Design a protein around this nucleic acid. Structure first.
Lengths: 145, 116, 154, 110, 49, 102, 48
RNA sequence: AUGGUAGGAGAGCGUUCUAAGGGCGUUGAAGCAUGAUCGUAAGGACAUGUGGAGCGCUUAGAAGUGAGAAUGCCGGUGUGA
RNA sequence: UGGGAGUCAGAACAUGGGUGAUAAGGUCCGUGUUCGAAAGGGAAACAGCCCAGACCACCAGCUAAGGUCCCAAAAUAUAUG
RNA sequence: CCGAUAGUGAACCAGUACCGUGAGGGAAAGGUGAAAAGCACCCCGGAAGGGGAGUGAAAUAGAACCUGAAACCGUGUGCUUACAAGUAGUCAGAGCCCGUUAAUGGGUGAUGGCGUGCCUUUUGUAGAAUGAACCGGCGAGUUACGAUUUGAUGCAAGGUU
């Protein structure tokens, strides 16, 4: 074990970013957001610690699908009761709780570990152009093509 | 003449028990399941000594990609430029330079760019 | 298992109910007894050719002579046994702790004199052996015994 | 200064004696005695005997004052068991277990 | 020679092969016999001819 | 200020006064070794060798030609009576840098 | 009907965490003698 | 050149005993316990506690010479509780 | 030439064939490979398929099969549909 | 040759306790110390037990008496743990505590990656195929005689009893 840097608390500094979902595609936004949340954009990335920044998504109702995903692309869940399977379409979920849509899409791109859950707790997603987190002084972030 | 099984069984088992220090419950008290774990432990260590190198190269490459995308460049094109410019420098040393002295990393990113 | 006392009957039925299948309490895996392959009364002696025997004796004596561990005297004049006098004799002759003394045929007086001293052994020319030759560090002979061994080994 | 008392080969099981021993560990002697008087378990008077023996040892052999003492250590260990072939059932075995009780009491100084 | 400096002639003596004493010998479990059959059995084998 | 040297079959990043551990060399304790293959030099000025920098040595002083901690190499094949146990102690040499030239 | 695996020390002592005795009340006898059991004129010098 | 099961070949580590030599021991032997030690492996030392009389080393020689499994045998002790 | 063996339950894949129903993870032959007795990377996991044969260290590098949105290393590359 | 699971079944209470109608079968069980000097006396307690005192070189040598292993049962503490899916380890790795046969040290382990026990039998077993509750002890290619073939040595047209 020669020299390789290993970030820890007392080394790492987390920031606050704001991303506008208007006119954007769901998965193509969510991949980049997951990368930000996990810290792949940082040179001090270490996987056994939560290097990574905070992210704010604002509009979330102008999010766009392609094709007929509005009526196809059904989300399922199960209550662990018999015949307790339930369904809902993506357009329905967009006009009703569009924040859950994006947050679940991003938590699906994050891993299902303890650190992954902590990293997904750093995602604040809203409906509409206003957010409360002005005290944290967030910077606007433009997505890469 | 007769020879009885004295002290060698006990020594042989005891040093395995001692190798099994820190294990959960019966796996630091009982010879059979302790021995079973120590063997497994050595096999795991044999393969992990080799997984280590892969994992660390993976880490260095991730860091270099991050450092390059700040200068609007991918890992792939950066390393092609380095190879063409002659640089025979490790990914590890690259990562450490990118963390410590960003200026030098920019300075050789310029060379990677102008070699294309 | 055949010589251990008892063990005639089968201790339980072949199927039992939930037990291992056994045939006698004196089987070898039982504490009671029954040894499988142990020692047996026998002998370890073996023979080899007479020529080899003679060669071994000659080689031993030649080693003892070329190591300057050979001494030859005239006769032993012991009219009675005296361990003390034999001790003084082995003091005069600068002999080590281990020494073999070879008479021609038999001298009970010198035998009795040297019997009780540690390291000392007494032998006849006919009764020489490679073991008590090699164990010794020095070898004192009478002239007659030397000639006798010379003729019977030459 | 520590005064100790042990009672060996008591015909009660350690699992049963330890339940009541756990209440008096770290207590003052008077309140421990009270707890033992107010607990209705078979081992309470036995433990009381041991405790009072320890306090008497402190008062006689070490000349300590019994008003400012506390139970420092209190434990039960296993003694030798007795095997009994239960005839009432169907050829079963019954182990009568036994305990070595120990309590030590201190003033809290040196 | 000396009894405390005894040495046999070179090539005169070998150690016997001890069967049934673990894996690393190469003669441990089956003791050279293979797995099953008539020849694996004690007193087994078939008579000559 | 700092330098990238190549010794063994690998690259090391060094500063002055630093202690390093390196694959075995053919020198003795107390002696002085000079690394000649330098790839990069940093600090105020920067020098980037294509392979190397046409000069640019690094002097160091040797200590402790020693052996590493033992590792026990164990392997087994489960249902087959086949295992192997070996020991290994890798040699190293320790050095302390005294000066880097450029 | 029978256990398929033995119980470990951990599981045993986890199960034995609610298996203990509570503490009695012990209102100290204001009248005389040893400490009285609560709402009990104890045979051993109690005055509840 | 060096993956490896039936299997063939080779070289070794340890155990009890014997011969010889040379040694250790109430200023504390063997056993037991602990340790961050050495050796490519089997395995070998050293130090400290406990114990209170025998035991190593070198070379050779003999074997009741190495166990984790046999619904194995004998004892102790658990689990269910 | 001689000393010592073990083995005589085989499996899949591809290809040439019988049988079966141009059914079977079927069965019987033949020609190759792998497993058996072969770890490693890929095929989501998966003895038999693709790559490739582990003497031991290394926080060094080049490639194979398969790949470069995130899970999860590498092109949200170019150009044309 | 054995040295108390050995060696007689039996080192002691042995062909005895015990089993069986009977013929018969058939165990377990050794060690204070040099010397009994085998704990006067006091205290708690109904007594058993103990704590002092004392004998002794030694009483964690006190008759359940040399040594006193492991399983197993406990008491104290340093690190750690109540949003977590687990063949329990392994590689990486902060923080906290310690300080060695002093050498690129030790203990714990927030978190990340990898990872379906052993043996036997099988074409093939994580296997829902077998076996093992745990620990300790015992527990299986041996000896005689002969044949054959390799190595060693001696002598050699002779060699050998």
């Amino acid at each position: 074990m020669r020299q390789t840097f290993m970030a820890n608390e007392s080394n790492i500094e987390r920031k606050w970013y704001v991303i506008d979902a208007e006119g954007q595609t769901l998965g193509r936004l969510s991949s980049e957001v997951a990368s930000i949340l996990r810290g792949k954009n940082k040179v001090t990335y270490t996987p056994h610690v939560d290097t990574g920044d905070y992210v704010i998504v604002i509009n979330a109702s102008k999010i766009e699908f392609t094709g007929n995903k509005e009526t196809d692309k059904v989300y399922y869940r199960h209550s662990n009761h018999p015949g307790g399977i339930k369904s809902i379409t993506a357009g329905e979920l967009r006009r009703t709780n569009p924040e859950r849509l994006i947050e679940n899409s991003i938590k699906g791109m994050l891993p299902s570990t303890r650190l992954g859950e902590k990293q997904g707790k750093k995602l604040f997603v809203y409906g509409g152009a206003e957010h409360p987190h002005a005290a944290q002084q967030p910077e606007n972030y433009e997505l890469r093509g | 003449p007769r020879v009885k099984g004295g002290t060698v069984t006990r020594a042989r088992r005891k040093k395995t028990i001692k190798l099994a220090k820190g294990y959960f419950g019966s796996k630091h008290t009982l010879y059979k399941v302790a021995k079973q774990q120590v063997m497994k432990s050595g096999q795991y260590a044999f393969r992990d000594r080799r997984q280590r190198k892969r994992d660390f190269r993976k880490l260095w490459i991730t860091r270099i990609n991050a450092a390059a995308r700040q200068h609007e460049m991918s890992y792939s094109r950066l390393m092609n430029g380095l190879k063409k410019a002659g640089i025979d420098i490790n990914r590890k040393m690259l990562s450490e330079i990118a963390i410590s002295d960003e200026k030098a990393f920019a300075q050789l990113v310029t060379k990677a760019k102008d070699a294309l | 298992r055949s010589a251990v006392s008892g063990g005639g009957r089968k201790p339980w039925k072949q199927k039992g109910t939930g037990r291992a299948r056994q045939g006698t309490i004196r089987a070898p895996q039982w504490r009671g007894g029954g040894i499988v392959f142990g020692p047996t009364p026998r002998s370890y002696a073996y023979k080899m050719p007479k020529k080899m025997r003679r060669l071994a004796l000659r080689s031993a004596l030649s080693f003892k002579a070329q190591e300057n561990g050979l001494t030859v005297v005239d006769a032993f004049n012991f009219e009675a046994p005296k361990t003390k006098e034999f001790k003084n004799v082995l003091s005069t002759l600068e002999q080590p702790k281990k020494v073999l003394v070879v008479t021609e045929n038999e001298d009970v007086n010198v035998e009795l004199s040297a019997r009780n001293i540690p390291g000392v052994q007494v032998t006849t020319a006919q009764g020489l052996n490679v073991l008590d030759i090699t164990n010794a560090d020095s070898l004192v002979i009478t002239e007659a015994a030397a000639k006798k061994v010379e003729e019977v080994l030459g | 200064m520590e005064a100790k008392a042990v009672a060996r080969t008591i015909r009660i099981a350690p699992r049963k004696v330890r339940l009541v021993l756990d209440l008096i560990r770290g207590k003052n002697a008077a309140e421990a005695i009270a707890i033992l008087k107010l607990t209705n378990k078979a081992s309470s008077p036995v433990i009381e005997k041991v405790l009072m023996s320890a306090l008497a040892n402190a008062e006689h052999n070490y000349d300590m004052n019994t008003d400012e003492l506390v139970v420092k250590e209190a434990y039960a260990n296993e003694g030798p068991t007795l095997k009994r072939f239960r005839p009432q059932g169907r050829a079963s075995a019954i182990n009568k277990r036994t305990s070595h009780i120990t309590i030590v009491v201190s003033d809290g100084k040196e | 020679m000396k009894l405390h400096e005894l040495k046999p002639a070179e090539g005169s003596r070998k150690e016997r092969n001890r069967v049934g004493r673990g894996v690393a010998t190469g003669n441990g479990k089956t003791s050279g016999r293979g797995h099953k059959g008539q020849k694996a059995r004690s007193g087994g084998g078939v008579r000559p001819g | 200020m700092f330098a990238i040297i190549e010794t063994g079959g690998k690259q090391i990043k060094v500063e002055e006064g630093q202690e390093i551990f390196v694959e075995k060399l053919d020198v003795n304790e107390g002696d002085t070794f000079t690394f000649d293959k330098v790839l990069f030099v940093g600090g105020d000025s920067v020098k980037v060798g294509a392979p190397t920098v046409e000069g640019a040595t690094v002097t160091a002083t040797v200590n402790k030609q020693g052996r590493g901690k033992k590792i026990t190499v164990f392997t087994y094949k489960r249902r087959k009576n086949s295992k192997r146990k070996k020991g290994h102690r890798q040699p190293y040499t320790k050095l302390t840098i005294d000066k880097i030239n450029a | 009907a029978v256990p398929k695996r033995r119980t470990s020390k951990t599981r045993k002592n986890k199960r034995r965490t609610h298996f203990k005795i509570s503490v009695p009340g012990m209102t100290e006898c204001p009248n005389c003698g040893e400490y009285k059991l609560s709402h009990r004129v104890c045979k051993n010098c109690g005055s509840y």
